[PDB]
Design a protein around this ligand. Structure first.
Ligand code: HEM
Length: 371
């Protein structure tokens, strides 16, 4: 109901690799994107396609793979080589079934995190763990874009967080059942696991190149929203009378950080300003199952308030453990941004970026009880 696996959390537990046959037109373009962009015969092959009706997609894992395919195609079509040459008009052939499918899942008709990370992976040998070496994506855009690195390390962090997320019910039960000792354990447990997920985060150095990321992959993950290059938007010819602007799919559409902001009663989405508004806006780009879950956390009693009520340094400590773990993650994520965007982009937009993240970080910092 909340679509949260015990093992991989927000991620898609075991995603469909193969579409039905009726959608083989789709799978070839998508399967082979490194070549059709680098040759030039993507936009022409997308130009003349069959408006393949959506009805023949039975179950979920199908519909999600379809979004991934359709979406990967739409990024590749609209941006092309990604050298300042842009397609403002998306065909009636690709747009109408993608816009429909996207209405089925209540996701935007754009590549989002749910698609290009959560739904976009595979174990190579299914008896071997979920580790970088024994995993791979289903789709890239170009070669040496380091799509594997970005998508998988993202995914791996999702999975690290699954171990924390599955504790959450214990937290709310313990609170209701008035079981202090449990609640304390569960909170420390959560902090412990969010600390793991930091180590996991270290891998982004190993498996992604700054110059390669910023240049190649960053372009294909960008969206029409607040886009000089598509200021008016992208026209979904057939479906929408007008062009509709939708933001690109980052890990800022991840539920993980938001999940724990909410659990720990960190009022990020309170106040005006980009910081809150952005975070709030991003929930749209999450699956509705996952939106529901964050809404449910909010509805439950405040862990923060409970902890403060009790006058119990034990709880306070464990609470702060979680909060510190979350700050640490955001603190490290900042260093990543420096390395992978700031420095590249130089070989006050970059200052705006950093101030968004630092507000969010600071907001998270301020929820500490010792400080
Ligand atoms: C090279 C790797 C990465 C880069 C360059 C990067 C860059 C950014 C940037 C520029 C933003 C600001 C919003 C936006 O532009 O979309 C952002 C936000 C965000 N990123 Fe990343 N990111 C990276 C990896 C990750 C990973 C692996 C995660 C989680 C697994 C993550 C989680 C987030 C979250 C949750 C936000 C929203 C702000 C927040 O809640 O703190 N990022 N990232």
């Amino acid at each position: 109901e909340y679509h949260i696996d015990e093992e991989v959390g927000f991620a898609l537990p075991n995603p469909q690799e193969n579409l039905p046959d009726f959608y083989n037109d789709w799978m070839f373009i998508a399967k082979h994107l490194p070549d059709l962009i680098e040759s030039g015969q993507l936009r022409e092959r997308v130009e003349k396609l069959n408006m393949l009706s959506i009805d023949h997609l039975t179950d979920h894992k199908s519909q999600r793979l379809a979004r991934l395919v359709l979406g990967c195609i739409t990024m590749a079509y609209v941006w092309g080589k990604g050298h300042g040459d842009v397609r403002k008009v998306l065909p009636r052939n690709i747009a109408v079934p993608y816009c429909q499918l996207s209405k089925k899942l209540e996701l935007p008709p754009i590549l989002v995190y749910a698609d290009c990370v959560l739904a976009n992976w595979k174990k190579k040998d299914p008896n071997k763990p979920l580790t970088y070496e024994n995993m791979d994506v289903l789709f890239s855009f170009r070669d040496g874009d380091c799509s594997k690195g970005f998508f998988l390390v993202s995914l791996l962090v999702e999975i690290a967080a699954a171990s924390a997320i599955k504790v959450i019910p214990t937290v709310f039960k313990a609170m209701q059942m008035q079981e202090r000792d449990t609640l304390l354990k569960a909170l420390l447990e959560i902090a412990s696991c969010l600390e793991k997920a930091l180590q996991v985060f270290h891998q982004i150095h190993d498996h992604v190149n700054p110059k390669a990321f910023f240049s190649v992959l960053r372009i294909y993950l960008s969206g029409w929203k607040g886009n000089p290059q598509l200021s008016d938007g992208l026209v979904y010819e057939g479906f929408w009378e007008d062009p509709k602007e939708f933001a690109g799919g980052s890990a800022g559409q991840s539920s993980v950080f938001q999940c724990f902001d909410v659990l720990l009663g960190i009022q990020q989405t309170a106040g005006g300003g980009h910081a809150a508004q952005f975070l709030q806006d991003m929930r749209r780009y999450m699956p509705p199952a996952h939106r529901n879950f964050l809404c449910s956390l909010e509805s439950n009693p405040s862990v923060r308030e409970f902890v403060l009520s009790k006058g119990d340094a034990g709880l306070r400590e464990a609470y702060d453990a979680c909060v510190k773990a979350l700050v640490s993650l955001r603190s490290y994520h900042l260093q990543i941004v420096t390395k992978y965007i700031l420095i590249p982009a130089s070989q006050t937009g970059g200052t705006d970026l950093m101030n968004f993240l630092k507000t969010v970080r600071s907001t998270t910092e301020k929820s500490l009880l010792k400080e």
